Amino acid sequence: PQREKWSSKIDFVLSVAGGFVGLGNVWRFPYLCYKNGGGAFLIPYFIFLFGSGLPVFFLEIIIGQYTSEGGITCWEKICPLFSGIGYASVVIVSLLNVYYIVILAWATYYLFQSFQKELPWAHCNHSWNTPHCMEDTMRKNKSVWITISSTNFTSPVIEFWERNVLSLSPGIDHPGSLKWDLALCLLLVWLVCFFCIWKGVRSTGKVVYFTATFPFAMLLVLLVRGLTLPGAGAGIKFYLYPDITRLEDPQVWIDAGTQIFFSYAICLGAMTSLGSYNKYKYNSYRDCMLLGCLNSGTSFVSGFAIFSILGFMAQEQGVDIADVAESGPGLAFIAYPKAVTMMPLPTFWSILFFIMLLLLGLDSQFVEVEGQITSLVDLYPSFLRKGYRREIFIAFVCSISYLLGLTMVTEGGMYVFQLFDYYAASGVCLLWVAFFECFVIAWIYGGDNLYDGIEDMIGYRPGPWMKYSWAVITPVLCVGCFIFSLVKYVPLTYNKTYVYPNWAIGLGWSLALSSMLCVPLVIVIRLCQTEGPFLVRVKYLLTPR
Numbered sequence: 001p002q003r004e005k006w007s008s009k010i011d012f013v014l015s016v017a018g019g020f021v022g023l024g025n026v027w028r029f030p031y032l033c034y035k036n037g038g039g040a041f042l043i044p045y046f047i048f049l050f051g052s053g054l055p056v057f058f059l060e061i062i063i064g065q066y067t068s069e070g071g072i073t074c075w076e077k078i079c080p081l082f083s084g085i086g087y088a089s090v091v092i093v094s095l096l097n098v099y100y101i102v103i104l105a106w107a108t109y110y111l112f113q114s115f116q117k118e119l120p121w122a123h124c125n126h127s128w129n130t131p132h133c134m135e136d137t138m139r140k141n142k143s144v145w146i147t148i149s150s151t152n153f154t155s156p157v158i159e160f161w162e163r164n165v166l167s168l169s170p171g172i173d174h175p176g177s178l179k180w181d182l183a184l185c186l187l188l189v190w191l192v193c194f195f196c197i198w199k200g201v202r203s204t205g206k207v208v209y210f211t212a213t214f215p216f217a218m219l220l221v222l223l224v225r226g227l228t229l230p231g232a233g234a235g236i237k238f239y240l241y242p243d244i245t246r247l248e249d250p251q252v253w254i255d256a257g258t259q260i261f262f263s264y265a266i267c268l269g270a271m272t273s274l275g276s277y278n279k280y281k282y283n284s285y286r287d288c289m290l291l292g293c294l295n296s297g298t299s300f301v302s303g304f305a306i307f308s309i310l311g312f313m314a315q316e317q318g319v320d321i322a323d324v325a326e327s328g329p330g331l332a333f334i335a336y337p338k339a340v341t342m343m344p345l346p347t348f349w350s351i352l353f354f355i356m357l358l359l360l361g362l363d364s365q366f367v368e369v370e371g372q373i374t375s376l377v378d379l380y381p382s383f384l385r386k387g388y389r390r391e392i393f394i395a396f397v398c399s400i401s402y403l404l405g406l407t408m409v410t411e412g413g414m415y416v417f418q419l420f421d422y423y424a425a426s427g428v429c430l431l432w433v434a435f436f437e438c439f440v441i442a443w444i445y446g447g448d449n450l451y452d453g454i455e456d457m458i459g460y461r462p463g464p465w466m467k468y469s470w471a472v473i474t475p476v477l478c479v480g481c482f483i484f485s486l487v488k489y490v491p492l493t494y495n496k497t498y499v500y501p502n503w504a505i506g507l508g509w510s511l512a513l514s515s516m517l518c519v520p521l522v523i524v525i526r527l528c529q530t531e532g533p534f535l536v537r538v539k540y541l542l543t544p545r
């Protein structure tokens with residue numbers, strides 16, 4: 001039927017920017033970079049960015065424009081047999097939506113805690129803080145720390161994150177009592193998401209100019225502060241300098257490549273839908289490439305701020321930069337609050353920073369949720385619309401997503417969240433989907449043939465850059481990284497201290513496999529449903545419907 005077209009050009013640019021700019025740049029990139037030793041992460045991240053990321057991200061926009069369909073139905077138009085890619089993308093979003101909304105929930109909890117005379121993370125006087133708590137300034141003092149032994153003393157910010165916000169249990173094995181305070185916060189984030197999606201994204205556009213700007217503005221203040229903070233240079237040096245030994249290890253490549261696919265929201269089908277709304281004759285090539293620069297740029301800039309603060313923390317604590325914070329999702333929630341403590345009028349700034357996180361994440365969440373809803377409706381549009389069931393489907397998806405979300409808001413919730421984050425919507429699942437989409441477009445549809453289509457749409461022939469990426473560079477990268485993970489296998493660990501139970505690792509592979517399995521399974525299912533000689537069936541299916 002009718003397809004919505006973004007007004008002018010801004011309605012599209014802002015929406016895509018909201019899509020790929022969010023907690024992936026702020027929360028995820030620093031955490032992955034920290035766990036993978038600074039620059040050692042950057043070389044894979046950049047090789048993937050201009051080799052696989054930027055091309056595939058544009059690819060999704062192009063197919064959206066040309067097909068004029070949602071991410072699932074789009075694949076049937078291009079290559080009917082491989083419609084598995086569209087289904088795989090949906091499973092991947094659903095899992096992402098569940099975990100992504102919990103990062104936002106922690107921020108909501110933080111915002112509520114931000115409203116008090118003394119910031120909670122500032123001192124060890126608080127009840128949650130254990131006997132092993134010492135203020136960073138006290139640690140800096142030689143008399144308090146160097147003179148007097150204090151085994152395993154932890155920064156109050158770390159204790160507050162670990163023992164108040166998370167109530168970390170010893171392990172995933174014991175989930176512990178569901179934390180009511182966090183669950184209520186999770187409900188609040190979900191309620192905002194459901195209601196905003198109910199009313200649609202039209203309301204957001206009128207004020208977007210300010211809402212998009214506020215995060216960039218707040219990030220800039222944090223950036224200025226960290227560099228001003230003493231010890232900033234060591235943090236920047238750790239960030240920038242690349243360790244060649246780590247490059248040899250497979251883990252870094254997988255985390256970096258997937259971060260590119262997670263940050264740009266490639267293979268989550270979200271980008272394809274945005275492209276579909278965009279008009280046929282639009283120079284998306286110019287816009288998407290410019291937009292991409294922003295995503296990587298903001299990730300790189302947010303990185304400088306996080307690392308400079310870590311350098312400051314390292315100075316005062318006396319610990320090495322590698323060990324000063326959690327090597328995990330907690331890093332954004334540990335480093336940045338410390339910066340706020342140092343800022344003048346810290347209470348005022350803390351509220352600002354958490355609001356930024358909420359705005360950045362919620363905008364991304366709305367797009368992902370909207371994309372999931374639209375693709376699912378696309379499968380049976382007539383059936384859903386006539387009924388009031390479509391009107392409730394959004395509620396149904398949110399309610400289920402909240403209920404599965406509960407597992408991550410328990411005391412042992414972080415362990416489940418880390419399992420989800422590495423295994424689902426990151427890991428090999430994104431790599432598998434990426435290879436498959438590139439393989440189909442480049443080899444079956446014809447990359448050179450697509451170029452003819454793109455050239456008509458954007459008004460000029462695209463540079464050979466993309467064609468060689470979809471054909472050879474993205475496939476080789478994705479297959480090779482997957483091959484390493486199988487060849488040299490290290491099970492995931494939390495903060496380098498928690499060996500995961502065999503069952504949990506298996507459960508995680510079940511999260512990754514279900515999405516990965518979709519594409520082969522649908523290939524098999526399609527072939528079976530079609531009738532005729534197998535060669536004839538393959539040929540009929542391969543040709544675009």
Ligand SMILES: [Cl-]
Pocket residue numbers: 024025029259260263264295296299
């Ligand atoms: Cl990024």
